Structure formats: structure tokens, C-alpha cells
Amino acid sequence: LSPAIRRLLAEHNLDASAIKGTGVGGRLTREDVEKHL
């Protein structure tokens, strides 16, 4: 992740609730929201 990942959701205004975080344990990574962008 990066220090800009947090502001990345507040920049494009997107609900992570609609995105699936298949991270290592059900976490939200960047390869998940990106596909949505």
C-alpha cells in the first residue's frame, strides 16, 4: 500500500463496501480498487 491509498478513496469518492478485498485475510489492497477505477 502507499500513503496515498487512503486519500485515493476520498479523491474519487468510492464505497469500498462494494469492492471485494481478497487481501491476505479479507483485507482491501490496491489491486482490488484499481480494477474498479
UniProtKB/Swiss-Prot annotation:
Occurrences of domain Peripheral subunit-binding (PSBD) (ranges): 1-37
Modified residues (N6-acetyllysine): K35
Function per UniProt: E2 component of the 2-oxoglutarate dehydrogenase (OGDH) complex which catalyzes the second step in the conversion of 2-oxoglutarate to succinyl-CoA and CO(2).
Family: Belongs to the 2-oxoacid dehydrogenase family.
Subunit details: Forms a 24-polypeptide structural core with octahedral symmetry. Part of the 2-oxoglutarate dehydrogenase (OGDH) complex composed of E1 (2-oxoglutarate dehydrogenase), E2 (dihydrolipoamide succinyltransferase) and E3 (dihydrolipoamide dehydrogenase); the complex contains multiple copies of the three enzymatic components (E1, E2 and E3). Interacts with SucA (via N-terminus), the E1 component of OGDH complex.
Protein known as: Dihydrolipoyllysine-residue succinyltransferase component of 2-oxoglutarate dehydrogenase complex
Gene: sucB
Shown residues within the full chain: 114 to 150 of 405
